[PDB]
Amino acid sequence: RVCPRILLECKKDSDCLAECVCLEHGYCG
Amino acid sequence: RVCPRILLECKKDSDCLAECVCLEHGYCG
Amino acid sequence: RVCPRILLECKKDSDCLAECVCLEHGYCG
Amino acid sequence: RVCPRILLECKKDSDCLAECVCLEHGYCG
Ligand SMILES: [Zn+2]
């Protein structure tokens, strides 16, 4: 899985880069 | 992101297939 | 990268499953 | 598939970034 480790807040996966997922702490990972 | 539509429980991401991740509700997605 | 190893002929990546790519021998990989 | 738009030569897939693969023409893609 490709998820650059850029710190980004999110509500949905579409708020995230690449194949990062929106995790339960409100950040992409 | 490639995450099969297979119902799987998980404690860690490693429990999941492909690029699915372990969500805190206790299932892969 | 997620590429199921199902034998499939191709001309383009869109002929392939998942994140398989169309390789120079004419099969997905 | 996540393959950065970065010009890279390669002898093997391992030479490439992310989910890029080594094409026989000698570049990642
Ligand atoms: Zn991927």
mmCIF file of C-alpha atoms and ligand atoms in Angstrom:
data_model
loop_
_atom_site.group_PDB
_atom_site.id
_atom_site.type_symbol
_atom_site.label_atom_id
_atom_site.label_comp_id
_atom_site.label_asym_id
_atom_site.label_seq_id
_atom_site.Cartn_x
_atom_site.Cartn_y
_atom_site.Cartn_z
ATOM 1 C CA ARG A 1 0.000 0.000 0.000
ATOM 2 C CA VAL A 2 1.358 3.436 -0.896
ATOM 3 C CA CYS A 3 0.691 6.089 1.750
ATOM 4 C CA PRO A 4 3.132 9.002 1.941
ATOM 5 C CA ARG A 5 3.477 9.938 5.583
ATOM 6 C CA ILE A 6 2.396 13.552 5.191
ATOM 7 C CA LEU A 7 0.378 14.683 8.170
ATOM 8 C CA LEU A 8 -3.135 15.499 6.976
ATOM 9 C CA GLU A 9 -6.472 15.717 8.741
ATOM 10 C CA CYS A 10 -9.408 13.919 7.193
ATOM 11 C CA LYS A 11 -12.984 12.718 7.433
ATOM 12 C CA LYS A 12 -12.938 10.334 4.410
ATOM 13 C CA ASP A 13 -10.291 8.517 2.440
ATOM 14 C CA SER A 14 -10.783 11.007 -0.393
ATOM 15 C CA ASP A 15 -9.242 13.688 1.883
ATOM 16 C CA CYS A 16 -5.990 11.717 1.744
ATOM 17 C CA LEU A 17 -3.144 11.197 -0.670
ATOM 18 C CA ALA A 18 -2.462 8.053 -2.679
ATOM 19 C CA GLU A 19 -3.739 4.924 -0.858
ATOM 20 C CA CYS A 20 -3.810 6.529 2.574
ATOM 21 C CA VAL A 21 -6.973 5.876 4.560
ATOM 22 C CA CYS A 22 -8.722 8.128 7.015
ATOM 23 C CA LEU A 23 -8.090 6.603 10.421
ATOM 24 C CA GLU A 24 -10.024 7.036 13.635
ATOM 25 C CA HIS A 25 -7.814 9.760 15.083
ATOM 26 C CA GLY A 26 -8.797 12.058 12.262
ATOM 27 C CA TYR A 27 -5.564 11.808 10.292
ATOM 28 C CA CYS A 28 -4.622 9.961 7.166
ATOM 29 C CA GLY A 29 -2.525 6.816 7.462
ATOM 30 C CA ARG B 1 -6.517 1.157 -3.306
ATOM 31 C CA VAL B 2 -7.171 -2.604 -3.698
ATOM 32 C CA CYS B 3 -9.133 -4.027 -0.817
ATOM 33 C CA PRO B 4 -11.239 -7.099 -1.524
ATOM 34 C CA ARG B 5 -14.860 -7.159 -0.573
ATOM 35 C CA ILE B 6 -14.341 -9.960 1.981
ATOM 36 C CA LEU B 7 -15.659 -9.829 5.512
ATOM 37 C CA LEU B 8 -12.674 -10.195 7.826
ATOM 38 C CA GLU B 9 -12.079 -9.292 11.440
ATOM 39 C CA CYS B 10 -8.820 -7.979 12.570
ATOM 40 C CA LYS B 11 -6.703 -6.842 15.471
ATOM 41 C CA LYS B 12 -3.852 -5.350 13.269
ATOM 42 C CA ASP B 13 -3.451 -4.373 9.615
ATOM 43 C CA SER B 14 -1.509 -7.555 9.109
ATOM 44 C CA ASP B 15 -4.722 -9.506 9.609
ATOM 45 C CA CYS B 16 -6.122 -7.993 6.463
ATOM 46 C CA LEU B 17 -5.724 -8.851 2.762
ATOM 47 C CA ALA B 18 -4.131 -6.779 0.028
ATOM 48 C CA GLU B 19 -4.381 -3.033 0.855
ATOM 49 C CA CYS B 20 -7.191 -3.334 3.329
ATOM 50 C CA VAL B 21 -6.442 -1.839 6.779
ATOM 51 C CA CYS B 22 -7.744 -2.769 10.184
ATOM 52 C CA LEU B 23 -10.399 -0.312 11.303
ATOM 53 C CA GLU B 24 -10.980 0.224 15.039
ATOM 54 C CA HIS B 25 -14.576 -1.081 14.828
ATOM 55 C CA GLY B 26 -12.707 -4.459 14.334
ATOM 56 C CA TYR B 27 -13.007 -5.228 10.604
ATOM 57 C CA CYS B 28 -10.832 -4.844 7.576
ATOM 58 C CA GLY B 29 -11.698 -2.134 5.063
ATOM 59 C CA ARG C 1 1.362 -3.687 -5.438
ATOM 60 C CA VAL C 2 -1.651 -5.988 -5.727
ATOM 61 C CA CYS C 3 -1.583 -8.230 -8.801
ATOM 62 C CA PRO C 4 -3.440 -11.543 -8.575
ATOM 63 C CA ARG C 5 -1.456 -14.077 -10.549
ATOM 64 C CA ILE C 6 -4.250 -15.033 -12.930
ATOM 65 C CA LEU C 7 -2.899 -15.706 -16.387
ATOM 66 C CA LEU C 8 -4.356 -13.112 -18.749
ATOM 67 C CA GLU C 9 -3.261 -11.791 -22.120
ATOM 68 C CA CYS C 10 -3.160 -8.048 -22.600
ATOM 69 C CA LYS C 11 -2.185 -5.061 -24.702
ATOM 70 C CA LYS C 12 -2.717 -2.344 -22.027
ATOM 71 C CA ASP C 13 -2.859 -2.246 -18.264
ATOM 72 C CA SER C 14 -6.631 -1.811 -18.483
ATOM 73 C CA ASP C 15 -6.831 -5.412 -19.799
ATOM 74 C CA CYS C 16 -5.539 -6.559 -16.408
ATOM 75 C CA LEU C 17 -6.898 -7.059 -12.929
ATOM 76 C CA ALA C 18 -6.166 -4.886 -9.909
ATOM 77 C CA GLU C 19 -2.698 -3.260 -10.161
ATOM 78 C CA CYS C 20 -1.332 -5.754 -12.666
ATOM 79 C CA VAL C 21 0.528 -4.206 -15.586
ATOM 80 C CA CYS C 22 0.726 -5.393 -19.151
ATOM 81 C CA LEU C 23 4.245 -6.718 -19.586
ATOM 82 C CA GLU C 24 6.249 -7.198 -22.750
ATOM 83 C CA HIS C 25 5.428 -10.875 -23.204
ATOM 84 C CA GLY C 26 1.793 -10.004 -23.688
ATOM 85 C CA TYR C 27 0.572 -11.135 -20.278
ATOM 86 C CA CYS C 28 -0.399 -9.269 -17.172
ATOM 87 C CA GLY C 29 2.009 -9.215 -14.244
ATOM 88 C CA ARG D 1 -1.881 1.853 -9.117
ATOM 89 C CA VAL D 2 0.433 4.474 -7.537
ATOM 90 C CA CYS D 3 3.481 5.152 -9.641
ATOM 91 C CA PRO D 4 5.079 8.573 -9.297
ATOM 92 C CA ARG D 5 5.776 10.639 -12.341
ATOM 93 C CA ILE D 6 9.562 10.487 -11.815
ATOM 94 C CA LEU D 7 12.009 9.581 -14.537
ATOM 95 C CA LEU D 8 13.958 6.561 -13.320
ATOM 96 C CA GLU D 9 15.946 3.885 -15.085
ATOM 97 C CA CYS D 10 15.881 0.381 -13.929
ATOM 98 C CA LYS D 11 17.207 -3.118 -14.366
ATOM 99 C CA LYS D 12 14.609 -4.784 -11.983
ATOM 100 C CA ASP D 13 11.299 -3.765 -10.411
ATOM 101 C CA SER D 14 13.152 -3.187 -7.189
ATOM 102 C CA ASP D 15 14.837 -0.187 -8.783
ATOM 103 C CA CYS D 16 11.506 1.546 -9.023
ATOM 104 C CA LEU D 17 9.433 3.554 -6.521
ATOM 105 C CA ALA D 18 6.038 2.718 -5.076
ATOM 106 C CA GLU D 19 4.040 0.514 -7.512
ATOM 107 C CA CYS D 20 6.011 1.391 -10.587
ATOM 108 C CA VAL D 21 7.473 -1.621 -12.454
ATOM 109 C CA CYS D 22 10.563 -1.918 -14.580
ATOM 110 C CA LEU D 23 9.647 -1.925 -18.253
ATOM 111 C CA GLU D 24 11.968 -3.655 -20.744
ATOM 112 C CA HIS D 25 12.688 -0.377 -22.592
ATOM 113 C CA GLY D 26 14.685 0.349 -19.331
ATOM 114 C CA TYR D 27 12.523 2.808 -17.363
ATOM 115 C CA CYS D 28 10.090 2.601 -14.520
ATOM 116 C CA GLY D 29 6.393 3.021 -15.272
HETATM 117 ZN ZN ZN E 1 -1.796 -0.144 -4.492
#
